[PDB]
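Hi R.,

Here's the input for the 2-acetamido-2-deoxy-beta-D-glucopyranose complex you asked about:
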Amino acid sequence: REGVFVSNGTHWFVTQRNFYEPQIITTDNTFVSGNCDVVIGIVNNTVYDPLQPELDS
Amino acid sequence: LQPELDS
Amino acid sequence: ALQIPFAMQMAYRFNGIGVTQNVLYENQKLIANQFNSAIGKIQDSLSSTA
Ligand SMILES: *[C@@H]1O[C@H](CO)[C@@H](O)[C@H](O)[C@H]1NC(C)=O
Ligand SMILES: *[C@@H]1O[C@H](CO)[C@@H](O)[C@H](O)[C@H]1NC(C)=O
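And here is the predicted structure with 2-acetamido-2-deoxy-beta-D-glucopyranose in place:
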């Protein structure tokens, strides 16, 4: 939604451009546009969903 | 959200 | 100077003008081909007359 995608060893994070601040790649940290097949340099990953930790109760 | 309300 | 992939720099320069980053990657080859062709036209314009 803002900033950039980043990778660790094998974790991935999102951060703002101008100061490193690694956060989990959640749906509320991200947004969707189209299927993958168009995109140059995309990577397979898990996007975390915060709703299911709530609705499981 | 309401579509997910099956829980 | 911090290194950044050029296609990601373009995505920010799009973001800066109020076009959302996805519109670049959804069109990357077309954008590159326009840009490359346009630089050809620049060279031709400067070749044609002083
Ligand atoms: C994530 O980052 C920390 C610091 O680089 C490191 O200790 C940890 O092992 C990394 N984990 C993965 C799976 O990348
Ligand atoms: C992503 O993972 C799926 C797993 O079935 C695989 O079919 C696909 O080719 C992978 N794509 C990339 C870019 O690795």
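One thing worth noting: The helical segments of chain C are 6-16, 22-25, 28-48.

Cheers,
M.
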